[PDB]
Amino acid sequence: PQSFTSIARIGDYILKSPVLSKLCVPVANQFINLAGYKKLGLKFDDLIAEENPIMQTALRRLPEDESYARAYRIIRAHQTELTHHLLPRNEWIKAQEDVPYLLPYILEAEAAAKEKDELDNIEVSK
């Protein structure tokens, strides 16, 4: 995996650019609705793999109202596939509700892990 610090370093440079966001953002909105995760009642941060110690740290620090709602969306998405159906269009995720709710907990767990690791490998002399 790449890192979320590296993704946002590249992804912010595209958005503070007048000619780059002209080209790439119409392509990126077509990539989202051709993925089809909103039709299963899912945001994007539900799809992130969680078997690593940075991602296990960010799930403990979540508030427990957002932690209970995420566990119901995942259970609803497993029952939807074994019936091989989609949800009704009343219950799809709209484009305003797909927020990065887990990105701020992730980005500060990574900046603390980088700072701890570059203080264990030190070459201070006299």
Binding site: E64, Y68, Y72, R76, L82, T83
Partner: protein, 248 residues
């Protein structure tokens, strides 16, 4: 490679043993041994076929005992250690014309005629290739080809030139049932007989294939019904969410 170096493609005739429910024609196996004994056994062997396997398939017991007795087999030695011969019995194998391989090439201008016990299953085409090989010699070669001395043209052989000449002609055997022995009629019966020599289990195999497929299809249909009954409670399970009151 060119189509002259691959050989012509044999067509698809309609053999009576094609299909999943068909049997060999045992009157065309019986007439096929008559063309082997009179035209074919002069140069080719049948080394994988025993005498006893013909009883109940194309001849009776007293006929195969009479057929095997006109050949000489080597016996265990006498009380002085000298060789000894004996007539044939049912457990023996059908003999071939040559004692060794050098004597076979010496009578066929260097070429070696193969063994015909497995020739159906060892050729691309099967029954269609051995039939079309025999009834496919032209009366004259095509214009422009140059044959070696002592060769014959046949377009079903890869390369065009073969060391076997045409051996089937009209009315060269006389059948016992009274069937007219034409060129295509006798060529049909050797290929039905020679396919039995490669596959003697053919009629037994398709009868046990009937019992296995009927049993396994009624087991496959019942497992689809049984699975959907035991999986009914999971597919109809429901889920409601009410958000909890927030000071836990």
């Amino acid at each position: 490679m060119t189509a002259a170096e691959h050989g012509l493609h044999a067509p698809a005739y309609a053999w009576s043993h094609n299909g999943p429910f068909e049997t060999f024609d045992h009157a065309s196996i019986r007439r096929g041994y008559q063309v082997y004994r009179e035209v074919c056994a002069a140069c080719h062997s049948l080394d994988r076929v025993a005498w006893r396997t013909l009883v109940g398939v194309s001849h009776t017991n007293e006929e195969v005992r009479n057929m095997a007795e006109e050949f000489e087999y080597d016996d265990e030695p006498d009380e002085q250690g000298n060789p000894k011969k004996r007539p044939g019995k049912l457990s023996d194998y059908i003999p071939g014309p040559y004692p060794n391989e050098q004597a076979a090439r010496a009578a066929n201008q260097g070429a070696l005629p193969p063994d015909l016990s497995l020739i159906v299953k060892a050729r691309h085409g099967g029954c269609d290739y051995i039939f079309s090989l025999l009834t496919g010699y032209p009366d004259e070669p095509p214009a422009g080809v140059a044959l070696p001395p002592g060769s014959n043209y046949n377009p079903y052989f890869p390369g065009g030139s073969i060391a076997m000449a045409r051996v089937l002609f009209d009315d060269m055997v006389e059948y016992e049932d009274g069937t007219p022995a034409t060129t295509s009629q006798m060529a049909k019966d050797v290929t039905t007989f020679l396919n039995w020599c490669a596959e003697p289990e053919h009629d037994e195999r398709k009868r046990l294939g009937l019992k296995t497929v009927i049993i396994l299809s009624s087991l496959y249909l019942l497992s689809i019904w049984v699975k959907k009954f035991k999986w009914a409670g999971i597919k109809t399970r429901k889920f409601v969410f009410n958000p909890p009151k927030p000071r836990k």
